[PDB]
Amino acid sequence: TAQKKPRVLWTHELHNKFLAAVDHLGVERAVPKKILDLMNVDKLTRENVASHLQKFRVALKKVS
């Protein structure tokens, strides 16, 4: 009994694992390559998690 989405791309679920995986490694030294194993999801590569990370810093620069 539970949802049934094929290959989760970015849902509240895949977001909870990427959050506890970065925190578990310290967002300061947490890399997307090692966390890529934390996800262990199909269709998920290290360049996909490294893009959302570099996109946040950009969203952190100009914030009004």
Side-chain angles (χ1 to χ4, degrees), residues 36-58:
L36 172 59
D37 279 70
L38 276 150
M39 286 270 229
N40 199 52
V41 188
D42 50 18
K43 215 126 255 192
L44 271 184
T45 33
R46 54 159 201 305
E47 179 171 16
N48 272 83
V49 185
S51 278
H52 173 40
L53 182 90
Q54 289 181 218
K55 273 161 86 149
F56 190 54
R57 285 140 150 41
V58 167

Side-chain angles (χ1 to χ4, degrees), residues 2-28:
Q3 248 86 306
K4 187 191 138 229
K5 73 199 74 191
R7 34 184 260 243
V8 192
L9 188 89
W10 271 119
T11 52
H12 42 247
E13 197 99 31
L14 270 186
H15 189 75
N16 292 136
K17 312 170 184 190
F18 170 68
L19 290 162
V22 189
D23 200 280
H24 184 207
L25 316 150
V27 53
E28 205 243 330

